[PDB]
Design a protein around this ligand. Structure first.
Ligand SMILES: CCCCCCCC/C=C\CCCCCCCC(=O)O[C@@H](COC(=O)CCCCCCCCCCCCCCC)COP(=O)([O-])OCC[N+](C)(C)C
Ligand SMILES: CCCCCCCC/C=C\CCCCCCCC(=O)O[C@@H](COC(=O)CCCCCCCCCCCCCCC)COP(=O)([O-])OCC[N+](C)(C)C
Ligand SMILES: CCCCCCCC/C=C\CCCCCCCC(=O)O[C@@H](COC(=O)CCCCCCCCCCCCCCC)COP(=O)([O-])OCC[N+](C)(C)C
Ligand SMILES: CCCCCCCCCCCCCCCCCCOC[C@@H](O)COP(=O)(O)OCC[N+](C)(C)C
Ligand SMILES: CCCCCCCCCCCCCCCCCCOC[C@@H](O)COP(=O)(O)OCC[N+](C)(C)C
Ligand SMILES: CCCCCCCCCCCCCCCCCCOC[C@@H](O)COP(=O)(O)OCC[N+](C)(C)C
Ligand SMILES: CCCCCCCCCCCCCCCCCCOC[C@@H](O)COP(=O)(O)OCC[N+](C)(C)C
Ligand SMILES: CCCCCCCCCCCCCCCCCCOC[C@@H](O)COP(=O)(O)OCC[N+](C)(C)C
Ligand SMILES: CCCCCCCCCCCCCCCCCCOC[C@@H](O)COP(=O)(O)OCC[N+](C)(C)C
Ligand SMILES: CCCCCCCCCCCCCCCCCCOC[C@@H](O)COP(=O)(O)OCC[N+](C)(C)C
Ligand SMILES: CCCCCCCCCCCCCCCCCCOC[C@@H](O)COP(=O)(O)OCC[N+](C)(C)C
Ligand SMILES: CCCCCCCCCCCCCCCCCCOC[C@@H](O)COP(=O)(O)OCC[N+](C)(C)C
Ligand SMILES: CC(C)CCC[C@@H](C)[C@H]1CC[C@H]2[C@@H]3CC=C4C[C@@H](O)CC[C@]4(C)[C@H]3CC[C@]12C
Ligand SMILES: CC(C)CCC[C@@H](C)[C@H]1CC[C@H]2[C@@H]3CC=C4C[C@@H](O)CC[C@]4(C)[C@H]3CC[C@]12C
Ligand SMILES: CCCCCCCCCCCCCC
Ligand SMILES: CCCCCCCCCCCCCC
Ligand SMILES: CCCCCCCCCCCC
Ligand SMILES: CCCCCCCCCCCC
Ligand SMILES: CCCCCCCCCC
Ligand SMILES: CCCCCCCCCC
Ligand SMILES: CCCCCCCCCC
Ligand SMILES: CCCCCCCCCC
Ligand SMILES: CCCCCCCCCC
Ligand SMILES: O=C([O-])C(=O)[O-]
Ligand SMILES: O=C([O-])C(=O)[O-]
Lengths: 701, 702
């Protein structure tokens, strides 16, 4: 092997002048606007099909290979969705038939406007908790069965606003907001929310009466209310909830272990609820043990409702937090299946489909939902091929809402709470990410730990905003104090490494190579300046000021006649200089930062050589400063200004500055900042460190 | 002038093997915590000298060179500080003697604990506005005319004590570097919007109207309405006097800045205008003749110490934090200009400590928060300020005014004080020109400017700043969100690789792709990176693996059926035109298609880019080597390493070699901590440069 290269030394300007650069016209916003309004016939066809995805996938349905599958996954998931809807309507503190409404309308709208083929659309625990908190706040902030009616009305208006926000984000094509939530953040938020839900199910396991607490620290208020009244716990409910929680857990593991052997996952939720409903009815637990039951539900749908502006005004922030969490979750679950089954997934259409589904749901008295991973995993694991299975789940929910709902009358709320608690093992086990992130990346461990605390203390909605803000702040933490280094040549070749990391390294005399391994901007520009000064060994502005002082003294001593100018040196007729400094005042002291123009003097002054009449100036050995900008991705206004100041000061003390390792786009953007001028020129940019070093060597020889 | 190189090709590992690495110790947190508790004699002496800077700059005082200049500068800045304190006590909506207390106490404390030698310590308009808004909130949220102003004075003192406590705590924990979280354009937009706030807040004194104590959000509009809803009750004497003063001061301030050389000292115009205003207001009895609002009679002397209301503390925590952050940012900014202009070191943590102690003492003695005004620090410095003895002399004049000659400021109108404030406001108002400039240079900083302005005008000055800082952190993500990822090519049959779309006569080695992302890769852009890499190579590595696994499954089923035979020559098909019967894997078995293809059981290797027998079809790829130019990739977070590991494993399972080049030794060290390397992904994929990887590939292929 041999890396053999023989090319001329290239400055960025020289390379461009020797290589024809394809002239490429950048696409200005103006043009982008035109193609946007093309109105091509084909274009329109694409748009409409994109907004009504059912017109594409339905006509291509493989009946022989998907119908039976879709049917089975649909009946199974719908059976899960009925119970999940009842439980999550308990989480919202409204009658439970509204949970059935919530499990029927978004699935039906997403069947038409949705792009996922596997996600089960409906409520999930975190969003039901967020919606409940919003309604409790709205009822508190209102200028004046009734309580149930008021809560139900508020749950609908929050949902419509949440959906409108979702619909708006999808129309404006902002479907990329999901990138602003990292893996460590979502993890901490979701385990904190699982702890929230665990705490929220305690009033149903024990059957206690807990107020509608609101954030901050809502979880602790609930815990106090529960354990303060812990002695009133209904044992039958608890034993039941504990029995239901225990059994389902074991069966679920079996389903995850013997999955390959299992033809179909064992439906433990349906079986347990049926047995629970049966034994409660046969033994009349409601009277025998005073257990809390779901009760009788109205056999039908409710008439449409009008969104209340007052609720909208009092819950706008909560609805935003709700829309963002719903989109983050649904997209997240859908993405897993899209990468698993190789089909494209459009976020904008998702927001539109999730927005419209929520509007129809809030209009028809339901509450916000997107998807529950548990129910979706149940849909995908049971043979879900397309959104037809979802249509069958919504059909099962319909059947429950109109004809057989009366069977869910003797079912206890502790059983629903026990199921909702059983679905928490996946999110609760995410506490193991703390140690992993500690080992790998402590900024992401900080993101996780902080999100957990914020979510627990400030709540689901506010905890998330503070968490995203802190997540953005860690980016600054990572780049705030870059490990800048001085480089040196190792091997007498074109390899320049850290000077402190190897032996037998070589630094060309008078030359300094400095590397900042990060983008330079407002938060680290001062640090870059400090580290560059520590690396070169002096402050260029201080050297310039002392040189200007020395030149002022030379001019004062020579025009008085004590120092005669000669083209050979600084001969002095009298060597009786007395100690005296000018002591410039506040108004005049800035004359010491100006460039040294000694053209007035016949002979050049070697500032690094001894001066006449014992004038002392700090002598510098640096003549060439190379800045390795290879990992400097961007600059901002603050940093370009700091950079220019630094360079100007080094140039004014006659230190040639070279910037190497930058691409052509970097020099392109710097031109827009008006960085270059008479003093700082584009000839300071070279291709690599070695190019600059060879240029320096030939200049100096 | 030739770049001539003749060295061996180097993977990062071969370079570490050939060149012995200098062993360096671990900078452990425990041993660092060991140096923390030094208890050394000199260390104790330098710690105490730092916490008490006066013990180091006072003995080193140059009398014959500094004393008279400091005396003159102190006289001037104290005469300015009296009037500025009165005006800012107007801004806080308390009696005007508390502005004198705010101009006295922090200066005397900063004389002892301050590191700056040129800033004038005291209140400035933005902080007086913030303190007044915090005071209104405290009074509004307080659980149930002089008693109204007494409540406001107590709430101001308490807000000040809490602001000083927060500053002193931030200086004790050594967090004096938070000023870096405010960019030049954030500060520019904030100070322009705040100058607009201060302009609107002085209108109730120019016109002499009764405006309620509006609180944010949109207090500037609530206030604009209150003023113009009653613009018919405007006092004409107040407006005329305020106008004339503003005109004169503006002209002289210009005369001052321009003719700096001919004037030995700047013309004191604030002072002269105040004396003339008070004289023509007392002689002509403007108070009775035109019914103008005057400063009134002030209580001669200081007030006894007060105890901070914990209730006010509870109701103003957020406000006090904001008052503390804005105060530190302004003071540090003002002080920095002069540290740099005069070459002396400026400790930021001692700045926080001194400002916090000054605010605590001021609030205890019935003052309001203040850190420094750029206008008054300018007067002290331009009049010859050399040390903080000028601040001591300014505080002595404020003391003289408080105790002895405060009654002279009795007939002075408040419109004159408002006019002085506006004359000082023009400098910050002139920052609207930065909009167009930033638009041309950096639209992200233009966005920071405009959004900071809008957040500060619409929302409060405290919520506005918090919202503004958050959006400025978000623009950092905006920059590194959609990087201009590109494909490189060789240019000049040498070691120069540039954008494939930029020059003519470039050269792509057959089968090699070189991909460059010019940004750090993290959670917000790992998806965009994966998408652009897939667009660059021309295919999806995963789709290929699944199709090959699908094909291999069909090949294997056929073999189990005797329909074809496998021999060292290849696949022998006695039966051709096989029935097409796709397997249709289910949802729980489909994952088998992402597994590495293990065909070792088969006697011969399968050329997946050749023709497969019996109508089997797989996409063919020309790529056999992928170079990733990670030179400008600064950092990698956990999300990015996961996405990265994922992408690389897929390329490797489809037998495409992957190379990461251009990275430094710290970058690779960190990746080892992420558990990135393993049996499939090895540290051999790392090469020093692109040419090294390319040469290594040419050598492999040939
Ligand atoms: C491209 C990015 C898109 C951003 C879109 C942002 C949209 C922002 C636009 C509008 C929203 C903010 C103002 C409220 C709505 C305007 C109408 C209004 O008058 O406000 C009313 C309700 O307003 C409130 O009480 C809630 C205050 C805002 C909380 C939400 C902000 C954080 C969530 C957002 C997260 C942002 C990040 C989004 C990412 C998830 C109050 O005003 P009023 O009723 O006239 O008052 C009269 C007296 N009254 C009060 C008694 C009635
Ligand atoms: C309101 C209610 C909230 C309650 C929350 C309670 C949650 C916590 C409760 C239980 C968590 C229990 C699981 C811990 C990890 C188990 C798995 C693991 O191996 O991790 C390992 C590392 O150590 C860790 O990862 C855990 C570190 C502590 C995390 C919990 C507290 C911090 C929560 C955030 C702060 C909140 C408070 C912040 C303010 C102080 C420990 O396993 P091992 O066997 O020892 O190691 C074997 C070797 N191995 C590591 C290589 C494998
Ligand atoms: C509550 C009270 C708030 C009131 C606020 C009012 C503030 C604004 C009032 C007055 C501003 C007047 C100064 C403008 C600039 C002058 C200097 C300049 O040369 O700039 C130039 C560029 O153009 C600009 O820089 C200005 C663009 C508009 C900015 C003002 C509105 C945006 C404020 C934020 C949005 C707020 C609302 C957002 C929602 C809609 C114009 O100069 P020129 O001579 O034309 O150009 C010559 C060539 N040259 C450019 C190379 C030199
Ligand atoms: C991207 C921009 C935002 C999103 C798009 C714009 C917003 C779209 C969604 C708008 C809101 C949703 C549609 C409208 C909802 C309200 C729709 C309101 O209509 C309700 C009635 O139909 C109810 O009928 P009733 O008979 O029950 O009437 C009750 C009163 N009486 C008659 C009984 C006394
Ligand atoms: C998975 C989705 C469906 C889940 C259903 C619940 C789980 C199945 C097991 C339910 C509990 C066991 C069976 C039911 C026991 C209690 C059974 C309670 O009986 C209700 C009584 O009124 C008698 O039944 P009727 O048919 O007279 O009632 C008519 C009611 N309407 C039609 C007039 C309104
Ligand atoms: C497979 C579906 C779920 C699992 C099967 C269903 C659950 C089976 C377990 C039933 C619960 C266990 C039996 C009941 C336990 C509590 C046993 C409760 O007994 C209370 C009675 O002594 C008096 O009734 P009161 O309602 O007046 O309550 C007064 C309570 N003291 C003061 C007398 C104690
Ligand atoms: C490419 C440039 C433009 C990109 C689009 C614009 C920027 C999009 C990204 C924005 C950040 C990421 C999305 C948001 C994530 C966090 C989304 C956080 O949601 C906020 C809610 O949690 C707030 O709930 P609160 O209860 O605190 O509301 C209180 C409201 N009052 C009471 C104060 C009025
Ligand atoms: C970094 C950690 C935080 C910062 C350090 C810790 C906090 C330091 C600052 C603590 C607060 C400031 C010092 C204490 C202030 C309150 C100091 C309270 O004392 C006030 C009395 O001296 C007033 O005397 P009077 O005679 O007027 O008494 C009034 C009541 N009678 C007697 C007339 C009826
Ligand atoms: C900036 C620092 C000094 C600025 C001073 C302001 C400039 C002077 C111009 C003021 C206008 C005209 C002159 C003053 C008119 C109001 C002057 C009002 O005088 C009060 C009258 O009783 C006569 O004055 P006395 O000498 O009796 O006052 C003694 C008051 N104590 C000591 C008993 C309490
Ligand atoms: C450098 C020194 C400062 C600058 C120079 C000093 C400023 C000189 C300005 C002198 C006063 C300027 C204008 C005043 C014009 C209003 C002229 C109004 O005069 C009002 C009086 O006749 C009656 O007293 P009132 O206070 O009740 O006012 C009633 C007002 N109306 C109903 C009769 C109209
Ligand atoms: C290098 C690693 C260690 C880093 C050290 C710690 C990092 C510190 C940096 C923090 C972020 C940037 C600094 C912040 C500057 C902006 C400073 C922002 O000020 C916040 C206040 O304005 C909040 O005012 P509010 O109106 O919200 O208060 C009202 C309270 N209630 C009524 C709502 C309850
Ligand atoms: C306006 C006062 C009466 C209305 C009060 C109620 C409304 C308050 C807000 C009104 C608008 C704000 C006040 C007016 C602000 C506009 C003031 C806008 O000024 C911008 C120009 O000065 C900038 O152009 P220059 O050529 O000066 O360039 C900058 C200077 N160098 C750097 C080139 C030398
Ligand atoms: C804040 C985090 C980081 C650590 C401290 C958590 C604190 C705030 C938690 C732990 C225990 C909690 C308290 C537990 C009991 C009560 C009584 C009841 O009226 C509800 C609120 C209240 C008063 C809680 C307030 C919040 C609380 C004090
Ligand atoms: C929000 C930013 C981005 C643009 C819109 C600014 C809006 C909110 C501004 C412009 C004009 C302002 C209004 C002007 C007049 C009044 C009447 C008075 O009762 C004070 C508030 C109120 C009602 C203001 C509310 C805020 C306001 C409406
Ligand atoms: C009444 C409770 C208000 C709670 C406010 C919490 C504010 C948290 C700010 C966190 C700043 C760090 C970056 C997000
Ligand atoms: C009572 C009205 C409160 C309004 C609060 C609005 C908060 C807006 C925050 C925007 C933050 C943007 C970060 C990128
Ligand atoms: C926050 C966890 C503890 C909540 C309170 C538990 C019960 C404490 C005693 C209550 C007596 C009324
Ligand atoms: C939005 C700023 C101006 C608000 C209105 C000012 C007063 C206009 C006349 C009001 C008459 C009642
Ligand atoms: C699922 C089994 C339901 C059994 C119900 C028995 C009712 C008996 C009533 C006397
Ligand atoms: C009302 C609170 C709004 C919080 C928005 C947080 C956005 C963070 C962006 C980094
Ligand atoms: C009460 C609002 C406080 C929010 C502080 C935000 C700090 C900005 C950095 C994310
Ligand atoms: C060895 C030097 C010790 C210096 C101690 C200073 C103590 C100051 C207390 C105010
Ligand atoms: C600064 C000039 C003050 C003149 C005061 C005149 C007072 C006259 C009272 C009759
Ligand atoms: O919220 C949840 O736990 C879910 O999505 O299943
Ligand atoms: O607030 C101001 O304008 C100042 O500091 O001068």
């Amino acid at each position: 092997n041999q890396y053999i290269v023989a090319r001329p030394v290239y400055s960025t300007n020289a390379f461009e002048e020797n290589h024809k650069k394809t002239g490429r016209h950048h696409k200005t916003f103006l043009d982008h606007l035109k193609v946007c309004c093309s109105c091509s016939p084909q274009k329109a066809k694409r748009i409409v099909l994109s907004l009504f995805p059912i017109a594409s996938w339905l006509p291509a349905y493989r009946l022989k290979e998907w119908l039976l599958s879709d049917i089975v996954s649909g009946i199974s998931t719908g059976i899960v969705a009925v119970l999940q809807g009842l439980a999550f309507a308990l989480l919202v503190d409204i009658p439970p038939v509204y949970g059935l409404y919530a499990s029927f309308f978004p699935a039906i709208i997403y069947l038409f406007f949705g792009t996922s083929r596997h996600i089960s659309v409906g409520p999930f625990p975190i969003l039901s908790m967020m919606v409940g908190l919003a309604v409790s706040g709205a009822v508190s902030k209102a200028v004046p069965l009734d309580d149930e009616r008021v809560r139900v009305a508020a749950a609908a208006s929050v949902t419509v606003l949440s959906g409108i926000i979702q619909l708006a984000f999808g129309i404006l094509r902002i479907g990329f907001v999901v990138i602003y939530l990292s893996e460590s953040l979502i993890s901490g938020f979701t385990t904190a929310a699982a702890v929230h839900v665990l705490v929220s199910q305690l009033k149903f396991i024990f059957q206690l009466t807990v107020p509608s607490h609101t954030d901050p620290v809502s979880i602790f208020k609930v815990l106090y209310s529960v354990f303060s009244q812990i002695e009133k716990t209904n044992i039958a409910d608890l034993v039941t909830a504990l029995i239901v929680l225990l059994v389902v857990s074991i069966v679920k593991e079996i389903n995850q272990r013997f999955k390959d052997k299992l033809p179909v996952p064992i439906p433990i939720e349906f079986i347990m609820t049926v047995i629970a409903a049966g034994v409660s009815y046969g033994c009349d637990f409601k009277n025998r043990f005073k257990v809390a039951v779901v009760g009788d539900m109205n056999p039908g749908f409710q008439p449409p409702i009008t969104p209340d502006v007052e609720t909208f005004q009092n819950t706008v922030g909560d609805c935003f937090g709700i829309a963002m969490v719903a989109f983050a979750v649904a997209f997240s679950v859908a993405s897993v299946y899209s990468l698993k089954y190789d089909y494209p997934l459009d976020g904008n259409q998702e927001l539109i489909a999730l927005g419209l589904g929520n509007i129809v749901c809030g209009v028809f008295r339901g509450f916000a939902g997107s998807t529950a991973l548990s129910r979706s995993a149940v849909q995908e694991s049971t043979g879900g091929k397309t959104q037809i299975a979802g249509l069958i789940g919504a059909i099962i929910v319909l059947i429950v809402v109109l004809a057989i709902g009366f069977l869910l009358a003797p079912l206890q709320k502790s059983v629903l709470a026990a199921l909702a608690l059983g679905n928490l093992k996946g999110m609760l086990m995410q506490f193991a990410e703390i140690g992993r992130l500690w080992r790998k990346d402590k900024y992401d461990c900080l993101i996780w730990i902080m999100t957990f605390i914020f979510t627990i203390v400030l709540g689901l909605g506010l905890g998330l905003a503070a968490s995203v803000a802190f997540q953005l702040l860690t980016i600054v933490f990572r780049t705030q104090f870059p490990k800048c280094s001085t480089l040196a040549n190792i091997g007498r070749t074109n390899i320049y490494k850290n000077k402190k990391d190897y032996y037998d390294m070589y630094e060309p005399e008078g030359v300094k190579i400095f590397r900042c391994p990060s983008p330079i901007y407002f938060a680290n520009i001062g640090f870059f300046r400090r580290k560059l000064i520590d690396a070169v060994g002096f402050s260029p502005l201080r050297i310039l000021r002392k040189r200007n002082k020395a030149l002022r003294k030379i001019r004062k001593l020579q025009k008085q006649g004590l120092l005669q100018v000669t083209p050979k040196g600084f001969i002095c007729t009298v060597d009786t200089i007395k100690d005296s400094d000018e002591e410039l005042d506040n108004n005049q002291i800035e004359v010491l930062d100006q460039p040294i123009n000694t053209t007035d003097l016949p002979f050049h002054i070697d500032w690094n050589d001894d001066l006449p009449l014992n004038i002392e100036v700090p002598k510098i050995s640096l003549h060439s400063l190379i800045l390795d900008f290879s990992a400097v991705s961007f600059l901002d206004v603050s940093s370009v200004r700091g950079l220019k100041s630094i360079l100007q000061e080094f140039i004014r003390i006659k230190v040639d500055v070279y910037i190497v390792g930058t691409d052509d786009d970097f020099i392109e953007k710097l031109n827009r900042y008006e960085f270059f001028d008479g003093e700082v020129k584009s000839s300071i940019f070279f291709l690599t460190i070695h190019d600059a070093v060879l240029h320096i060597l030939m200049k100096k020889d």
